[PDB]
Amino acid sequence: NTIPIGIALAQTSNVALLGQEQVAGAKIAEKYFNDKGGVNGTPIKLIFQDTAGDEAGTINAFQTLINKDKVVGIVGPTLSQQAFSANPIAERAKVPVVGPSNTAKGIPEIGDYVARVSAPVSVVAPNSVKAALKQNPNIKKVAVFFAQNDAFSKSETEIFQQTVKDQGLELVTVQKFQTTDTDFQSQATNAINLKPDLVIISGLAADGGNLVRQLRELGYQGAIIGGDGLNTSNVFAVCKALCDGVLIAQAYSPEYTGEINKAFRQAYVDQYKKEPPQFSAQAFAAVQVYVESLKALDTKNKVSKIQLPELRTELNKQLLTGKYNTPLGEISFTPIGEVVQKDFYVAQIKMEKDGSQGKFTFLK
Ligand code: PRO
Ligand SMILES: [Mg+2]
Numbered sequence: 001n002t003i004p005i006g007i008a009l010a011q012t013s014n015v016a017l018l019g020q021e022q023v024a025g026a027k028i029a030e031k032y033f034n035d036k037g038g039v040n041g042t043p044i045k046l047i048f049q050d051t052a053g054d055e056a057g058t059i060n061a062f063q064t065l066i067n068k069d070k071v072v073g074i075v076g077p078t079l080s081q082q083a084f085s086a087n088p089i090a091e092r093a094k095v096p097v098v099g100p101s102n103t104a105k106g107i108p109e110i111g112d113y114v115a116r117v118s119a120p121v122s123v124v125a126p127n128s129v130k131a132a133l134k135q136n137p138n139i140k141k142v143a144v145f146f147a148q149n150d151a152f153s154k155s156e157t158e159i160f161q162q163t164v165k166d167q168g169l170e171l172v173t174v175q176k177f178q179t180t181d182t183d184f185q186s187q188a189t190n191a192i193n194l195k196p197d198l199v200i201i202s203g204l205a206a207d208g209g210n211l212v213r214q215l216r217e218l219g220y221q222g223a224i225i226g227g228d229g230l231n232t233s234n235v236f237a238v239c240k241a242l243c244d245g246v247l248i249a250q251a252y253s254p255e256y257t258g259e260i261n262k263a264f265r266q267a268y269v270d271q272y273k274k275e276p277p278q279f280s281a282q283a284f285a286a287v288q289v290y291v292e293s294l295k296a297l298d299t300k301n302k303v304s305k306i307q308l309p310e311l312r313t314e315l316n317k318q319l320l321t322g323k324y325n326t327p328l329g330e331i332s333f334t335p336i337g338e339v340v341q342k343d344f345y346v347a348q349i350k351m352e353k354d355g356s357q358g359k360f361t362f363l364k
Contacts, residue, residue: 001304002045003038005290006065008076008086009100009283013053014179017205017234018279019078022100023048025280026075028267029287032260039294042304046287051077055085062089072294072311073098073319075286079204080104080152087114094309096316100286101279103228104155108337113316115337117285117328119251121156121228124344126163128225128249131346131363132198133167135247136223141172143196145187145211147203147229148176156202156227164200172196179207184214192220202227209238216242223247233277233360241355250345252281252328253362260288261327277360281327288326293319 007026010019030046038044047069049061058077065071066089073096077083080102090097091111099107099116103124107116133139142164146157157174165171172194175187188211191199199215199222201208208230215224226235226248236243254265254275264284268276294303296318303311323332332340347360 002043003294003303004045004047004069004071005287006069006071006074006076007046007048008051008058008061008065008074009048010053010078011048011050014206015053015078015204017238018101018229018232020234021232021277021279022078022283024268024272025276025283026287028264028271028280029284032263032267033287033291039291039303040298042298044291044294047071051082055082058082058086059089062086066090066093066095070308071095072308073290073315075100075283075290077102079150080107080155081150083107084110084151087111090114094316095312096319098286098289098319100283102152104152108334112336115320115333117289117326117331117339118282119339119341119344121152121159123341124249124251125156125159125227127344127346128247129160129163129167131247132223132225136197139169139197139223141170141194141196142198142200143173143175143191143194144171145175145177145191145199145201145203147179147207149178149180150204153179153202153227153229160200160202160225160227164198169198177203177207177211179204181207182210184211185218188215188218188220192218196222198223198225200225200227202229204229205232205235206238209235209243212239212246213242231278233274233358236349236351236358241351243349243358244351246349248347248349248360250278250347250360250362251341252278253345255362256327256329258325258327258329260325264327274359276327285324285326285328285331289319289322289324290315292324293322296322
């Protein structure tokens with residue numbers, strides 16, 4: 001007998017450059033928590049339903065997890081764009097959702113069954129601007145690019161634009177693209193002609209990494225910040241050597257000395273031979289929130305004997321009240337399911353072996 005927890009992530013499509021890191025973290029969490037006894041003796045069972053990269057796929061995954069797989073709660077989806085489209089299904093069904101990577105403004109406000117462990121763009125993104133200015137104090141002109149078809153990218157770019165203007169910098173252009181684009185020559189050229197010292201990109205990984213390449217190939221030599229959509233080790237194979245030096249803010253540090261983080265990190269390194277990335281840590285944390293909340297319920301009433309609709313509502317109520325020492329540090333929730341997290345970091349991509357392998361190097 002097991003407790004089914006739904007995992008709805010982008011396992012396929014270009015969005016899987018991000019989603020597969022989340023799958024990896026979720027799988028590590030399942031083994032970790034079950035090795036520790038699951039929920040007071042009752043194992044959890046993660047049930048994966050691929051969302052692909054679109055709204056339709058996410059709607060399908062949520063419907064299946066709720067109705068066919070009868071899950072007690074969902075971790076997912078990968079994109080805020082997908083969350084806005086599919087989370088109302090869970091809200092209507094009164095099934096909790098914990099977003100592992102949905103950082104757009106407005107996610108917690110979708111409803112009282114929606115929470116997130118992923119800190120919002122407003123608190124995360126400005127850290128990389130601050131880091132860029134520390135590395136080059138004489139940056140004056142900034143060019144910004146964003147994916148206008150994506151809810152997160154639109155939300156993130158607003159943060160970046162306001163942040164740079166508030167720092168007294170000159171925003172010379174805001175260039176639009178689509179996450180599905182492959183050619184960025186015209187936007188890159190138009191930005192380059194305006195002589196920026198810093199370029200900031202809000203998109204996803206396949207698109208973002210190719211935009212980085214095309215900027216460099218057109219002769220742009222200045223600093224580059226990538227937003228959270230580029231924040232995956234799978235971007236290294238996209239921009240290759242041209243990824244080198246890109247600054248990306250982080251909501252996770254592999255070096256945090258919490259016991260659970262140390263165990264998570266060890267398991268990740270053992271399996272993948274690299275340090276755990278943010279999205280893996282955040283996915284682990286989402287599973288942890290469910291496991292520890294189920295344990296809290298279980299001490300009062302055995303979870304394996306609670307009927308599903310009741311269990312779902314009680315689980316949602318419980319998780320919002322919990323405090324958790326996760327890979328992300330100590331976290332808790334506001335009454336609408338926003339994460340409470342104050343520690344953030346910045347990393348810089350360091351490439352090696354003629355662009356064939358890379359790592360996120362954390363700035364001190
Ligand atoms: O909210 C989103 O869509 C992006 C995906 C990775 C981090 N946040
Ligand atoms: Mg909420």
